[PDB]
């Protein structure tokens, strides 16, 4: 059944949409809309899928997908690590109780302060994006009387280094006193449904691993990144962690494997509930105007991304489903076939748990949505709805 | 001179970039980066250009361009109205001292509470986007024992109604007892450098006005929208408010109605600049990357529109220029401020100025990657006011703390 392919904790009961045994109509009425609703057991089940498929690997949640501290803590309690790209993500992981030995720091978002905090915190590994970054980390570690543990990010566009020029970076890094070389990192892409390219990519990593091992390097960690795609479109068939493990089994090695899933844990975990405000026709074209926009979920607008949209209440049209934002590009779906809806009725936007709230802004002075976590009939407000005061607070009495 | 074409308060002094007599390097060292910096006198002078060009018009600032309450207050003190599209902008306009008699409400961003608040506030005019909205506004006004003053948004997208079918909506609205029909609205587009289309557009509205007046409607207001473009590219030549007034003078002589304009970008756009510090240089094959501390989280226009913003060094040093991608801290391939752009070779620690960032800049700034948003400062004749403190991590997640 299509609905349960997206998320098995979703069901219609007597024409009413439920998540983990709680009515979405009741949630919308109680907490208001727009509303982000997350399944606790979906998140746990997806994390556990990685642990079952890769029992000896460290599974670092990619915090970029969703920064809600209650969600990061949920994962932390199951033994998740944290793949971080900023000092704010470090702060969050620490707040969530994820220990530094399970934290890896990727990307180019690395100011002097952020790096100082991370070195001082003794995180597992920096996934290094430039030679200059090697020099900067070396200086910082020296000033703290510490070692910074590193991996070079290799590409088997601003990111990584061609794997064929990677040994050169490893050799350069070996000369810097305050660096300890401990890993190799790749991250080959995102929303990957055909997992075939992972085999060649990991082959090349292991080939590099063997070469550096022969060269005398002690590579303790192979971080093969994230990027496993999820079901967005009805016809999408998503890979499972077990599929990846099957693919890479005869390639994988003494080094500890690290994986960095984000979307494949959070994406289908969350749904966005929005209320229909107005219907209008222009010529033969139909518009359904709702209370959520690109300010709440930006993916359709900026990527032309597909999110499946369903009615919260089923009853007995092709339309643009559009938001409140004063932009022609503010839509959630274009030329989309849906059952006819009326003012006041609720729609569920699926697959909104990753890169959803995370990219939410205050454009048009719109406070962001409340966030609710549901677990087998129980409810927890994990982010209060903002008010106007919150948006402009840093400008008040300053 | 190129820089003054963007903003005449910008200048180099002995190799150092200044705005209104304040060094950008000092501001960057004092307040940190990323930093949004605004020129007070630029904002005032753009607004006054509209006032001088259209002395009998209501000039409604389009709050969507920039919601900083100190900047909105600045315009409100000059007699600006507010063109709003949400309850949040209503709140903001009111806090900034803009009276509801100078507030107009557009867009499809109109929930029951927002509409109730605006009707209750007795705003000048609702620019109505649908017939169902007419019914809803009428129902709400009745419930408050008030009248809602309306215009129909006409298209001479999800917005407006074919002007050829607007008269049917005016007829429909005349039968709704809690609405008072007072206006006609058009908003023809945005970032318009060749103003030619305004003539035909306004001609259609003037013809509709004549037709409605003959039919017995009392059209007090003609709100002809915003959309005047600004200089983004070195080769762009922006129109002046006086150019629009010249184009429309004879056309508007036909009407007795008070004219309303809704400029956003043309007041704020070149008023603001984004200062960012270089973190890393990186070469990858034949490409030079200049990695800075500001990204799509701070200014989204390059990433999502492939928009051109002019980028200059805060310190000129008579160095060779290079072609570079100027990219931010965000973990996306699409997080860039400029691609394949010529720029003076700059080093780690140096600052860059991203021009034309005052409109749809901070307004679209997010917390993606748990990045606190930039401080905002307002410069006026050698002195400065902090108009938004830099956020911290606690601010981002505050609504999740303790319930």
From Swiss-Prot, chain A:
Substrate binds at residues 263, 299, 303, 327, 355. This is Diaminopimelate decarboxylase. The active site is at 326 (proton donor). Homodimer. Belongs to the Orn/Lys/Arg decarboxylase class-II family. LysA subfamily. PANTHER family: DIAMINOPIMELATE DECARBOXYLASE (PTHR43727), GROUP IV DECARBOXYLASE (PTHR43727:SF2). InterPro entries: Ala_racemase/Decarboxylase_C, DAP_deCOOHase_LysA, De-COase2_C, De-COase2_CS, De-COase2_N, De-COase2_pyr-phos_BS, Orn/DAP/Arg_de-COase, PLP-binding_barrel. It catalyses: meso-2,6-diaminopimelate + H(+) = L-lysine + CO2. PROSITE patterns: ODR_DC_2_1, ODR_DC_2_2. Specifically catalyzes the decarboxylation of meso-diaminopimelate (meso-DAP) to L-lysine. It comes from Aquifex aeolicus (strain VF5).
